[PDB]
Amino acid sequence: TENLPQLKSAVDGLTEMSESEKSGFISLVSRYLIEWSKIQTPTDEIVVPYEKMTPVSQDVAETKNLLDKLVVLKLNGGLGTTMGCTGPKSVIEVRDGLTFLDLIVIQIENLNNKYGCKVPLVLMNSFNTHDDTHKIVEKYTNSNVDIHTFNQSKYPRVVADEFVPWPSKGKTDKEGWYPPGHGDVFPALMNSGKLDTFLSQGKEYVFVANSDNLGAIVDLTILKHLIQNKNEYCMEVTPKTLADVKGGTLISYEGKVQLLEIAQVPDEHVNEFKSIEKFKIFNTNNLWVNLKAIKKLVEADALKMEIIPNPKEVDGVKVLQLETAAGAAIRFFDNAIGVNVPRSRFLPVKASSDLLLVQSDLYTLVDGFVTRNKARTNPSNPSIELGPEFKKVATFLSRFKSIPSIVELDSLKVSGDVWFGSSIVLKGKVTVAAKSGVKLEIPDRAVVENKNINGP
Numbered sequence: 088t089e090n091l092p093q094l095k096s097a098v099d100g101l102t103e104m105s106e107s108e109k110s111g112f113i114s115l116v117s118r119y120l121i122e123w124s125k126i127q128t129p130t131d132e133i134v135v136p137y138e139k140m141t142p143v144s145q146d147v148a149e150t151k152n153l154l155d156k157l158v159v160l161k162l163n164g165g166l167g168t169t170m171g172c173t174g175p176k177s178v179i180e181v182r183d184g185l186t187f188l189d190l191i192v193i194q195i196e197n198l199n200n201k202y203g204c205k206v207p208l209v210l211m212n213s214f215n216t217h218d219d220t221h222k223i224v225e226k227y228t229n230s231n232v233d234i235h236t237f238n239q240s241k242y243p244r245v246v247a248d249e250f251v252p253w254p255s256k257g258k259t260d261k262e263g264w265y266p267p268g269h270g271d272v273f274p275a276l277m278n279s280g281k282l283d284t285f286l287s288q289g290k291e292y293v294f295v296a297n298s299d300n301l302g303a304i305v306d307l308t309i310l311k312h313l314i315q316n317k318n319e320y321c322m323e324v325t326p327k328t329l330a331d332v333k334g335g336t337l338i339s340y341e342g343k344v345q346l347l348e349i350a351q352v353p354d355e356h357v358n359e360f361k362s363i364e365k366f367k368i369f370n371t372n373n374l375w376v377n378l379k380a381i382k383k384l385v386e387a388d389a390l391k392m393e394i395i396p397n398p399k400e401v402d403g404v405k406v407l408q409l410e411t412a413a414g415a416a417i418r419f420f421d422n423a424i425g426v427n428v429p430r431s432r433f434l435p436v437k438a439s440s441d442l443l444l445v446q447s448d449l450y451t452l453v454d455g456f457v458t459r460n461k462a463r464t465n466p467s468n469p470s471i472e473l474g475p476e477f478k479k480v481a482t483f484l485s486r487f488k489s490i491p492s493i494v495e496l497d498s499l500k501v502s503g504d505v506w507f508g509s510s511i512v513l514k515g516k517v518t519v520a521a522k523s524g525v526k527l528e529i530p531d532r533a534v535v536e537n538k539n540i541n542g543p
């Protein structure tokens with residue numbers, strides 16, 4: 088529906104929304120209420136190859152000067168629900184009993200203890216993760232890193248049929264609201280005052296990343312490039328692969344580079360994105376942004392990102408949750424670029440199949456970094472697919488007495504009730520399928536190479 092003044096009225100009726108939230112929400116709604124025959128590929132001048140960038144000098148002074156201007160920030164608004172875990176997704180243990188946050192903290196600690204810098208870490212969480220995060224972060228109280236947190240905007244989900252805020256019908260508990268996407272990082276950094284708290288200290292850029300992307304580590308070649316070339320925004324993209332279905336690509340449109348996402352794509356064109364031909368790059372959501380520019384553009388209300396409707400059905404009630412993507416803000420910044428980086432900077436962990444990959448001998452932890460085995464000569468990881476039986480992390484761990492060796496694996500598909508013993512080795516293309524009513528136990532020490540195991 089589209090009665091806007093009617094919508095504003097109800098929004099102001101919702102007392103728990105702060106004034107700044109009511110405003111930002113109404114602006115989104117207002118704007119809510121793609122000539123494919125023009126889409127272009129960005130030139131190499133706009134999307135710079137990382138290998139062409141100049142590394143820092145041997146004098147640590149240059150490193151300290153750059154680090155003294157930096158603030159690191161992570162995206163932590165999500166829960167561990169997909170992987171059968173309660174709490175923030177960042178607090179799931181990924182490698183060696185260390186959580187995603189623990190590894191990110193170690194990494195920055197290693198930076199601060201290494202260079203004598205005091206780069207601060209900022210966590211942007213959601214109401215669906217704030218208090219739990221608040222509790223966990225205290226563990227790092229004496230760590231050599233200042234951990235800052237803040238909550239991004241809390242907006243009312245909108246009932247789609249009648250177009251009114253769900254809280255107005257009385258859905259005022261947690262399921263009545265939602266965080267408006269990571270694009271909200273810009274106004275929320277302002278609303279939180281952290282931006283002004285960092286500007287009063289000297290920071291100039293924020294490195295933004297998904298909390299569950301293990302490949303998102305600080306890269307000095309990239310930070311250097313933005314400083315010397317005055318790039319106010321840099322989006323790390325990676326070559327698009329068959330695995331990259333759900334996400335965005337960077338495109339040139341109207342002579343500027345911009346994120347292209349599914350809502351903007353005409354019906355008769357959805358598989359071309361999926362292709363490996365038309366679009367050859369894919370956003371990793373590792374974003375580098377200039378802080379003064381964020382302040383300037385948020386206060387001027389310039390960040391007009393495309394809306395992502397994300398519809399859901401809760402308790403039966405079909406609702407709409409309008410959101411935005413951080414990468415879509417790239418078209419509003421000056422001298423903005425994409426940098427095409429190797430997939431080692433893009434290791435998302437979204438299912439227990441990814442944990443199998445990261446807990447196996449394909450990787451090891453090195454000073455807080457999940458480091459790929461170099462004995463793996465072929466860059467690509469093995470494709471791993473596990474049935475629902477492996478969905479909950481605890482059940483996944485119960486089903487692998489030890490994580491099997493997969494350095495020599497091309498692909499593993501597991502289905503049905505399957506339990507694995509310790510010290511197993513898997514090579515090539517492997518499948519294990521237990522039929523209904525059957526439980527399959529892979530004994531300890533088994534070597535499975537290019538085999539289809541369909542029963543005892």
Ligand SMILES: O=c1ccn([C@@H]2O[C@H](COP(=O)(O)OP(=O)(O)O[C@H]3O[C@H](CO)[C@@H](O)[C@H](O)[C@H]3O)[C@@H](O)[C@H]2O)c(=O)[nH]1
Pocket residue numbers: 162163164165211212213266267268269296297298299300333334335336346369370371372373412413414435
């Ligand atoms: O309201 C929200 C929405 C998400 N997140 C966090 O944002 C991160 C990214 O979200 P996620 O759903 O994992 O990914 P998408 O938003 O689908 O994609 C992002 O990340 C992909 C790289 O993994 C890029 O290709 C896409 O351009 C970029 O939008 C996660 O850590 C979330 O915790 C928030 O902080 N707040």
